Design a protein around this nucleic acid. Sequence first.
DNA 1: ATTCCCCCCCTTCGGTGCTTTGCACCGAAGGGGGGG
Lengths: 388, 551
Amino acid sequence: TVPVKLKPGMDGPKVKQWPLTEEKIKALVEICTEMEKEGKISKIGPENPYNTPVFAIKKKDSTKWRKLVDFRELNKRTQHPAGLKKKKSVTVLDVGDAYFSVPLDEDFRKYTAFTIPSINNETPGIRYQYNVLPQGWKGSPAIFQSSMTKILEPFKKQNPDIVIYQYMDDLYVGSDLEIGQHRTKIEELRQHLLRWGELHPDKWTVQPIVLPEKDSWTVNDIQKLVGKLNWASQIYPGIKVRQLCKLLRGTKALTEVIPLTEEAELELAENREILKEPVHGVYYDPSKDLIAEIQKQGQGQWTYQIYQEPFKNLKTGKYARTNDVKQLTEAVQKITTESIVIWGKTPKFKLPIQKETWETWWTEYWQATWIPEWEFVNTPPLVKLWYQ
Amino acid sequence: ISPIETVPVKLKPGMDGPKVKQWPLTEEKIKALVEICTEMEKEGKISKIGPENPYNTPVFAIKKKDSTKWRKLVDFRELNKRTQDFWEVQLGIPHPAGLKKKKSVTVLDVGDAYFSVPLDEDFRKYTAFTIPSINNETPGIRYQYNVLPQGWKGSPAIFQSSMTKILEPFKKQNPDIVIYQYMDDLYVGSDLEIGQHRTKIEELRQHLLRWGLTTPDKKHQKEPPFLWMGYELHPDKWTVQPIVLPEKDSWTVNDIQKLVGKLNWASQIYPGIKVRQLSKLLRGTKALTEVIPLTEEAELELAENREILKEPVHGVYYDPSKDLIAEIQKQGQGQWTYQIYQEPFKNLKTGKYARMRGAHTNDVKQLTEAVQKITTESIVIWGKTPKFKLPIQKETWETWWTEYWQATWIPEWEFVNTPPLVKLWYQLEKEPIVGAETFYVDGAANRETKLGKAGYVTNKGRQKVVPLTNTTNQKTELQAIYLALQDSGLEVNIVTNSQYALGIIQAQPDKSESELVNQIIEQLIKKEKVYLAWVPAHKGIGGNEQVDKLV
DNA sequence: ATTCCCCCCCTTCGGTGCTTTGCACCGAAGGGGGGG
């Protein structure tokens, strides 16, 4: 393809580089030197005013470094098979080393500039720009889209039951086959791709809300329960707290045992049936963006909610498993992979972490080829365990 | 001139060259300016232009800290505003602590750096200026720049790129030579003996001269100590150049501002530098000439800083075969010091952290911020994260990071027993306390008149209300909690409808900008066991009928 | 009386978001230090 103009009335990325470890710097220098020889990248000067961050990862624990470029700002200025979710097994293969044979438009190469730093600022950073289609940019799968069909036509027609979805540099192969037959067909697909150059979405279960069950209830216990139902009323209406509020009238000791009246057990039980229900009316708007909140429940437990509008949850989950940042980073990569398979868009996370803490360590444990947008929450969202 | 390819530089789209007219200058300045212009024209730095150049730019002179000498400067502010944007390749400042011990070391400076790199041919017309046409009448002679101008915002980046392009073949043919390049300053280190190193230095000098860059011998350093980037470099140690603090008798705002700046510079190698009590004198006074009398606390800090800055202190270089260790100490009032070293009592570099982030915070939060700052700074200099020695105990950190709602982490670290220790001064019970009084608190303030009442009711036959003036809902809720703490015993359950007060208290602070919160904190430390519970605001709970229709 | 680029700290002020239209957090700009 060719004209890849930006969105009208805005400029290119101007993001800073942020420091890198000397182990990762040595990997980037070796990688970029090899790419320069092949003509994939070329050195530039300071007259280019654009810059995007770059770093290296160790995806799949293959002990081979992989270069990653944060195109999150270039993707925002450039301008899905519903049966994949119901599939049994979704294999995710990498087709990143295939866009290197498609030259990039000459007028667009200036926006893909990046800088490799140096230890102790020994030398000014070495700058490069992309000559071929880069990895991580939203236009790479779009320009190569017309070329993927030619390679996927001899395969998809041979096995119509195979569902194949491409996002960024990742191929999602979904089949209703067995543990072994799926793998054999994957090898056939892999070798088929070479000629021209593990998820289980069926096992994913929503996380409901559960009321605590007790034989005897204290004033403190009822007060905590009343707060839950009042908060849950906004999510699941039809929840009324009157016969439970009537047990919290008058000044009482917080540990006083309150005998549950026979007429109040109905509301406690009735609200439980309402609570044990998938709240309908949640329709994924294709135009709006996905927001994923994450809460730290302690003891190595994390809960998340994916929604487009407040109190209208599209998906609720719970990720279980010393290193808090690594656990959060693993959760982000697992939620994002879920959203790509289910909806096809990476969510906009609201991480429960300090901004300085996240930027320092998130690159260490990252292993995906895509980066979602995230925002850092500061208010303490711990008043009662609403999502326990 | 340098036979290096020019960098294509243009103006911002839709812009034009400057047309500013030159302000009048005294007859003393004009003579030096015309002499300088004549010399530069005869050297080829500038060229005379005819009447076809519409653009112009004012030009003035400075003393150059030499009285007799008069450096010529050009006010390129208009051109810089109209000049395209550049991306700076200078991402930071080299530090001597990151240097490795080298057998042979040289420091060189390129003379007349900017005047050696040619300017792009199409851009020369915008750089046109005119000399103050004499006292007056006859027009001035007008010149245009042929090389990189001084005062133009694109000069540093272009020169840095040209220097890198010049130096890359030499580095490729000499892989065992370390070259730190900062603008026109070169630091060359090698493990060769003095003779071979000196032979290689002359080879580098002839390489630069092949590209027109000259290295005068007056800025060429061959013997230690080396004055490099504000530091004194010795064969096995380094120091900052001498620091002279002011000795005024009646300080002003500007004097204190300059005093604090030098103490921050000295804190990189002098341990224990405090500037908290001195920087507090800069709050509330905005005039730069106002005389601020020194307070008692500020006088104490100044004397301590003077005493610390008296003995000679030096750092050491970096050995890649040893592990970096950073030790942190707490000085009080949100101030921390830290020393990064490799072997004990030989500091690679010191530093301090005194940033006050957030209105309410504790020592454990600030320790994590200091650790993160140290890690980020160490990655820049050495590329690896050091092992930490913190004054917090393992159990305290375990409790904090397990009970905290946020995700926090600290890399490999060990406990060092040096007081004062970092601890949490109080803890909130997870369950209500049996036998202790329950205080249902509530504070309501009228927004219109800024008047309110804060009060509490209790399980027993007690009840209190107190009126507050110039207050809000949040302040009334905090005051209600404070009253509940004030008139209770050692164990207390407090039920409140305010999420703001619960969010403030639950973080376990010990210092706060708000004075009311400090009283609450000092009351919480006195108590033995405290339970804090949240209740819905207006849903008929016991703290809603007899606590809201009241205060 | 008049310039330029880079890093840092400390204080002040405006913007943003949630909620409790006050309060907490953040980023940019002023001052200062240092380098060229």
